[PDB]
Design an enzyme around this catalytic site. Sequence first.
Site, PDB file in Angstrom:
ATOM      1  N   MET A 249      -9.632   3.013  -2.724  1.00 50.81           N
ATOM      2  CA  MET A 249      -8.810   3.275  -1.528  1.00 50.81           C
ATOM      3  C   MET A 249      -8.284   4.721  -1.509  1.00 50.81           C
ATOM      4  SD  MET A 249      -5.976   0.911   0.090  1.00 50.81           S
ATOM      5  CE  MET A 249      -5.116   1.448   1.626  1.00 50.81           C
TER       6      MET A 249
ATOM      7  N   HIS B 189       0.887  -1.177   0.000  1.00 50.70           N
ATOM      8  CA  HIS B 189       0.000   0.000   0.000  1.00 50.70           C
ATOM      9  C   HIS B 189       0.919   1.220   0.000  1.00 50.70           C
ATOM     10  CE1 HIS B 189      -3.879  -2.007   0.654  1.00 50.70           C
ATOM     11  NE2 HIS B 189      -3.534  -2.450   1.810  1.00 50.70           N
TER      12      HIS B 189
ATOM     13  N   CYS C 179      -4.136   5.787  -1.982  1.00 47.77           N
ATOM     14  CA  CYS C 179      -3.105   4.811  -2.262  1.00 47.77           C
ATOM     15  C   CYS C 179      -2.969   4.662  -3.761  1.00 47.77           C
ATOM     16  CB  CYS C 179      -3.443   3.517  -1.505  1.00 47.77           C
ATOM     17  SG  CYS C 179      -2.574   2.073  -2.107  1.00 47.77           S
TER      18      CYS C 179
ATOM     19  N   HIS D 136      -4.047   1.306  -5.637  1.00 43.47           N
ATOM     20  CA  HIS D 136      -5.420   0.872  -5.366  1.00 43.47           C
ATOM     21  C   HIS D 136      -6.412   2.032  -5.447  1.00 43.47           C
ATOM     22  CE1 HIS D 136      -3.359  -2.345  -2.889  1.00 43.47           C
ATOM     23  NE2 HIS D 136      -3.701  -2.842  -4.053  1.00 43.47           N
TER      24      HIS D 136
HETATM   25 CU   LIG Z   1      -3.431   0.378  -1.196  1.00 46.54          CU
END
Ligand SMILES: [Cu+2]
Length: 99
Positions: free
Chosen positions: A92, A37, A84, A87
């Site tokens: 996210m 992440h 992020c 993602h």
């Molecule tokens: Cu992420």
Amino acid sequence: IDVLLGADDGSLAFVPSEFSISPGEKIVFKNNAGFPHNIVFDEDSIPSGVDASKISMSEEDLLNAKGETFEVALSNKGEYSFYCSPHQGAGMVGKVTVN
Ligand SMILES: [Cu+2]
């Protein structure tokens, strides 16, 4: 405050994803699930005159193990959008207000 990267069921979310802090309060982002992440602040979606580089990861930087953290303290008040990078399309994303 603590913020999970990934929910405990593996969802691609910040927990919590929206929260408020006081100035100079530290945020600990901890790699929980579904990593790697990162945490990037949107340079076009933070308070005017803040340097994003000072408060974010690089897009190219990753946390890739359970329990890696990233910590930051914000002092200008206003709203800060973050995401992020890998993602972001999964949803996210998050927002913090410094009040
Ligand atoms: Cu992420």
